[PDB]
């Protein structure tokens, strides 16, 4: 690894600098280097890892969607044959996105998840595993597509099971997991009723628990609750 010679603390410091500079590819490479030191991650470090890769893959997904839309319009009837270039370039972006997903899933499997014993770490990593299989599913078309979808479902489900037993309904990790699993149901599993039911039940159970929270915790929980409501409004 190109980060193997840098101190763990220096990698974390530089990931924070990269975030301030909006250099998310650098941020992700620094956090990959920190994970590969082999020590468990703190809550803040997990946040840095997730934010870095979410921004990298988010840009790739946005580009993939632009190119896929152009590719589909070029394949309708009446469109002029533009040659292989749109498909080739969509494939190039797709392969780069798959590579990033494989990298994150590799960090989770070697060995973040197996060493995560507390609910807050284990749920966070299993949510990430579901997210990155979900991103693979968005672009999947081959023999393993159903297994990719089910790998996302399985990871999200294990995270949900732990979160329901070990975390309050307002815990932002539990809320963010439910938000994303609900989107998985809607966009990946073709299960809009499950997506809506999960978002509504999550929202209502969190609402009933807000009275236990400090002002700071209330702000974090209500932020994600608003995203749940935003999706419910989009879907109903």
């Amino acid at each position: 690894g190109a980060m193997g010679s840098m101190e763990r603390a220096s990698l974390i410091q530089k990931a924070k600098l990269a975030e301030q500079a909006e250099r998310y590819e650098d941020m992700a490479a620094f956090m990959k280097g920190a994970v590969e030191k082999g020590e468990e991650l703190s809550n803040e470090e997990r946040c840095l890892l997730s934010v870095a890769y979410k921004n990298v893959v988010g840009g790739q997904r946005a580009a993939w969607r632009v190119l896929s839309s152009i590719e589909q319009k070029s394949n309708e009837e009446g469109s002029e044959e533009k040659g292989p270039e749109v498909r080739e370039y969509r494939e190039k972006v797709e392969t780069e996105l798959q590579g990033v997903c494989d990298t994150v899933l590799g960090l989770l499997d070697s060995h973040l998840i197996k060493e995560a014993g507390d609910a807050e770490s284990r749920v966070f990593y299993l949510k990430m595993k579901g997210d990155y299989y979900r991103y693979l599913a968005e672009v999947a078309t081959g023999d393993d597509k159903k297994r990719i979808i089910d790998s996302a479902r399985s990871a999200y489900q294990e995270a949900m099971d732990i979160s329901k037993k070990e975390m309050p309904p307002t815990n932002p990790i539990r809320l963010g997991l439910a938000l994303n699993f609900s989107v998985f149901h809607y966009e990946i599993a073709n299960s809009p009723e499950e997506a809506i039911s999960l978002a509504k039940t999550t929202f209502d159970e969190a609402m009933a628990d807000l009275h236990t929270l400090s002002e700071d915790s209330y702000k974090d929980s209500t932020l994600i609750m608003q995203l749940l409501r935003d999706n419910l409004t989009l879907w109903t």
Binding site: L179, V183, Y186, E187, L227, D230
Partner: peptide, 5 residues
């Protein structure tokens, strides 16, 4: 994009 975090 629906919202995800």
């Amino acid at each position: 994009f629906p919202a995800t975090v």
